């Protein structure tokens, strides 16, 4: 809630996308609880 800075974001469809399917980017959809601010979760366990 006390973040200070610029959240820079731009479109990168011409770089991080491929017609055959660019599946190298993943995202965590299920989790036991809510994530704390500035926290990383790389575990591949099955929820």
């Amino acid at each position, epitope marked *: 809630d006390d973040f200070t800075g610029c959240v820079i974001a731009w479109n990168s469809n*011409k*770089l*991080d*996308s*491929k*017609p*055959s399917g660019n599946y190298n980017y993943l995202y965590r959809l299920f989790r036991k609880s809510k994530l704390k601010p500035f926290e990383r979760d790389i575990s591949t366990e099955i929820y």
Partner: antibody
Framework: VQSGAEVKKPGESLKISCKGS????????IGWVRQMPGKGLEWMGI????????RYSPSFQGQVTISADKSISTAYLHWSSLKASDTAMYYC??????????????WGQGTLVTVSS | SALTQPRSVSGSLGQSVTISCTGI?????????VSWYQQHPGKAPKLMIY???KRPSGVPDRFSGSKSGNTASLTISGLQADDEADYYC?????????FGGGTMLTVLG
């Protein structure tokens, strides 16, 4: 198959070409890499089939421009005020679904431009 | 930075050869931005080794690579007569394509 290399003098604005096949010229990056006799490959820049967001090498910002044709899927290059050290084997490469956008999946045939007087 | 490669190597039929590749940079996002290209003398170059953590399609299994800090190596086994070609390592971590100093693969017999 590529066009022949005619003997030209520095300052005549010659042109080279390359013909590729086996893909769709819609969203795959494509560029040109030269090779001078006695040295390795030298990457100049690439071009996008849509918005031509061309990113040239720092040593090729104002030395060569990309003028590839999209309607015929044939790449082309344009020069202006050439020099004697411009003789190199230009190879046409594309993005390909093998690696990332900058990775070169396939390559062309290559034509060695000869400059003499 | 400029990639440093041996000018000429001396292999042998049936043996192995390791081509060195130094000067590889890295950016935020990964450090496996290493790719090798196979260019026959007077012929068209062909992509041989890229993403050494994986295996390309159509390339024989006798080609592999490794990573150790800023120095990479190309492990090639089963040297034959038709394997005589030029090899160059590439680094594209900073969205810039760079090549080595040129390598000439020679075999004995």
């Amino acid at each position: 198959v590529q066009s022949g290399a005619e003997v030209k003098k520095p300052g005549e604005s010659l042109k080279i070409s390359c013909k590729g096949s086996g893909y769709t010229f819609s969203y795959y990056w494509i560029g040109w890499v030269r090779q001078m006799p006695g040295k390795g490959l030298e990457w100049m820049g690439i071009i996008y089939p849509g918005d031509s967001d061309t990113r040239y090498s720092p040593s090729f910002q104002g030395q060569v421009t990309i003028s590839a044709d999209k309607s015929i899927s044939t790449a082309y290059l344009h020069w202006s005020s050439l020099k004697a050290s411009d003789t190199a084997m230009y190879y046409c490469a594309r993005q390909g679904d093998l690696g990332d956008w900058i990775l070169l999946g396939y390559w062309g045939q290559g034509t060695l431009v000869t400059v003499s007087s | 930075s400029a990639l440093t490669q041996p000018r000429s190597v001396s292999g042998s039929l049936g043996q192995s050869v390791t081509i060195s590749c130094t000067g590889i940079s890295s950016d935020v996002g990964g450090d496996n931005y290493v790719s090798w290209y196979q260019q026959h003398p007077g012929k068209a170059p062909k992509l041989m080794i890229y993403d050494v953590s994986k295996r390309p399609s159509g390339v024989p299994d006798r080609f592999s690579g490794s990573k150790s800090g800023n120095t990479a190596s190309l492990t090639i086994s089963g040297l034959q007569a038709d394997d005589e070609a030029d090899y160059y390592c590439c680094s594209y971590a900073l969205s810039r394509v760079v090549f080595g100093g040129g390598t000439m693969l020679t075999v004995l017999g």
